[PDB]
Design a protein around this nucleic acid. Structure first.
Ligand SMILES: [Zn+2]
Length: 645
RNA sequence: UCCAUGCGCAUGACG
RNA sequence: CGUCAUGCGCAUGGA
């Protein structure tokens, strides 16, 4: 392509660069062009032609292995589409020793490199290659993993320069808008761009200026648009005030925010440091009440009632299964005295939801397509069920994959499923997952959201088909945030055009400085990291429960499996804990009712594994970490010769 | 295909 | 530095 021609042109001979273009301009295709010409150059030179294409995500890897690299190189060259989940019969160093072209994923590579410079399995170095290709360069700032790679590259380049010579590979680099970082200033942005380049050790950026018109003919752009707009709550607030007085809790802030939550968690910390009740227990309950609040700010109040209903339901189930004090008695009765009545209040009408329904219905009377963003998963589920109740345009939710923070997440397969159904669902409900292959779209809304400029442009790329209906529902400073996204998009060109028109000498000087700076930063960080974990004590401690400061385990009685998990056999421990299971790894609970861990099935054994998240330490410098890795002191791996017979 | 777990990473808001 | 929310990758064991 013509616009692609010049931007590719320098890379054809040396010229480790960056490229940045907008959505839809087929950057994969030009990348293929550079590949084929490079490999043909190596056939002309009879040199080791190798390309080790990198990404951040598996799905783009599979996508390109289907659609882009094979259909243009299926004949000439060897290709393979790699991942961490796709079980490959062979290790990585062989697909280095074969398969001249590689689609891949990042941390596979770094793992092989570590195995190189740390023993185990046959390693690999960068010197085996002649070229590297990247997508989404903008992640190359804050030691994100595909930046260890270039720090190694920079280390070896400076070894070459102190020599000045073992060779090193050409380095392409692609991206959308390259992102700007922590800026209200042009100088900071410029410095950021230079940090990015020197983390890639590139030469220029080389964007498109000549043929912007033939390209503009392709990209129909969206229209930047804004479309913007008790008593049940107050009863709950009065309950909260009652509880504050009940245990002398000083908020130092208002109800319905994050600050209140933060102070509650700090009370939980202090009271575990004390081992005292009525203090952290209230922190937990008020954390729950504040959840209910700041969903009530945005969600139908029935959903908060259901949230806390299931909560206290589980609480009663815990305590009864335990039995099968005044504090929990007060709290439970305080809830259940108002439970049914608040259920009654929840049905009453009287919002963001109302303007929202209005906009939505008006578009679907205008138009077919539908996209929704927001912050959280529970919001997606709740609004999905709610619109399923409200008289309608079928719908479906979407969320990510992490098994974190409340929910049973979804599946990659099922994500693909729902996306194809949308290629048929009318309106999707998603968290920040949806920069992906969803085009020909109208009404990407932002219901109670914030995003950054790069997320903004990735959302732009998804709304197409000659119809943009950017909508925003948060007012009754968020309009500020689209305005600053525009401002940053202006600033980025303002800085790129300043650095393109820059001397090569001073350019090289600044980039060398930033390279040395980042390398020394990594070195000092590794120093402090090695200094970090040095204790490795067998048994120095006693693990106690956190509601009740009762002894639970000792320092030596613990053992390790899978070099991941911890366990306490020695059924003197078994005199303590209680089991539960409802809906196949059953859960443990306390002699009070605290939840502790899981009965993990391992090699026939029902080992009781516990999570440090729900226990407290006594070396009494009481401490708490939430993660074993925080704790330097080491425990042994298990020897089954104990359990025999 | 599903389950559970550990680890690292970035983003945004907040202090 | 911590908190929250969100998203991503890798490595495990099992069905
Ligand atoms: Zn207890």
């Amino acid at each position: 392509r013509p616009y692609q021609m010049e931007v590719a042109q320098p890379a054809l001979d040396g010229k480790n660069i960056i490229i940045c273009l907008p959505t839809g301009s087929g950057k994969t295709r030009v990348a293929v062009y550079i590949t084929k010409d490079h490999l043909d150059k190596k056939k002309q030179a009879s040199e080791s032609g190798k390309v080790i294409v990198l990404v951040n995500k598996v799905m783009l890897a599979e996508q390109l292995f289907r659609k882009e690299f094979n259909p243009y190189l299926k004949k000439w060259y060897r290709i393979i589409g790699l991942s961490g989940d796709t079980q490959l019969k062979i290790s990585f160093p062989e697909v280095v020793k074969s398969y001249d072209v590689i689609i891949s994923t990042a941390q596979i590579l770094e793992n092989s490199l570590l195995n190189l410079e740390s023993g185990d399995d046959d390693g690999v170095q960068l010197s085996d290659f002649s070229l590297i290709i990247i997508d989404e360069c903008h992640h190359t700032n804050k030691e994100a993993v595909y930046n260890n790679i270039m720090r190694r590259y920079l280390k070896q380049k400076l070894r070459n320069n102190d020599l000045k010579a073992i060779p090193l590979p050409q380095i392409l680099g692609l991206t959308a808008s390259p992102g700007v970082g922590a800026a209200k200033k042009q100088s900071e942005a410029e410095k950021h761009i230079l940090n990015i380049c020197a983390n890639l050790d590139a030469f220029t950026i080389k964007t498109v200026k000549e043929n912007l018109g033939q390209l503009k003919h392709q990209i129909k752009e969206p229209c930047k648009k804004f479309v913007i707009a008790n008593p049940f709550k107050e009863k709950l607030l009065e309950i909260m005030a009652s509880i504050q007085t009940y245990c002398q809790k000083s908020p130092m802030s208002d109800f319905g925010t994050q600050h209140y939550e933060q102070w509650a968690i700090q009370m939980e910390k202090k009271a575990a440091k004390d081992g005292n009740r009525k203090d952290r227990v209230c922190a937990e309950h008020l954390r729950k009440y504040n959840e209910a609040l700041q969903i009530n700010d945005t969600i139908r109040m029935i959903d908060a009632y259901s949230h806390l209903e299931t909560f206290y339901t589980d609480e009663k189930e815990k305590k009864f299964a335990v039995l099968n004090d005044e504090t929990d008695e007060f709290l439970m009765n305080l809830f259940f005295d108002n439970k049914k009545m608040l259920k009654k209040l929840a049905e009453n009408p009287k919002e963001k939801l109302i303007k929202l329904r209005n906009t939505i219905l008006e578009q679907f009377t205008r138009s077919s397509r539908g996209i929704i963003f927001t912050k959280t998963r529970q919001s997606t589920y709740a609004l999905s069920q709610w619109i399923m109740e409200n008289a309608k345009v079928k719908a479906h939710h979407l969320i990510g994959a992490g098994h974190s923070s409340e929910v049973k997440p979804m599946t990659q397969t099922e994500q693909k499923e729902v996306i194809s159904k949308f290629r048929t669902i009318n309106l999707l409900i998603a968290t920040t997952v949806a920069g992906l292959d969803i085009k020909e779209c109208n009404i990407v809304i932002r219901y109670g959201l914030v995003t950054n400029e790069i997320a903004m442009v990735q959302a732009r790329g998804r709304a197409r088909a000659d119809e943009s209906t950017y909508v925003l529902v948060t007012s009754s400073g968020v309009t500020e945030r689209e305005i600053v996204n525009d401002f940053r998009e202006k600033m980025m060109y303002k800085a790129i055009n300043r650095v393109q028109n820059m001397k090569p000498e001073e350019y090289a000087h600044k980039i060398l400085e930033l390279q040395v700076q980042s390398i020394l930063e990594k070195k000092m960080k590794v120093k402090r990291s090695i200094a970090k974990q040095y204790n490795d004590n067998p048994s120095l401690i006693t693990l106690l429960c956190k509601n009740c400061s009762m002894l639970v385990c000792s320092g030596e009685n613990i053992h390790v499996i899978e070099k991941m998990h911890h366990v306490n056999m020695t059924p003197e421990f078994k005199g303590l804990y209680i089991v539960r299971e409802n809906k196949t790894n059953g859960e443990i609970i306390c002699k009070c009712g605290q939840a502790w861990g899981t009965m993990m099935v391992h090699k026939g054994l029902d080992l009781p594994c516990l999570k440090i998240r729900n226990f407290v330490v006594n070396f009494s410098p009481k401490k708490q970490y939430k993660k074993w890795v925080e704790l330097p002191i080491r425990f042994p791996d298990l020897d089954y010769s104990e359990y025999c017979l």
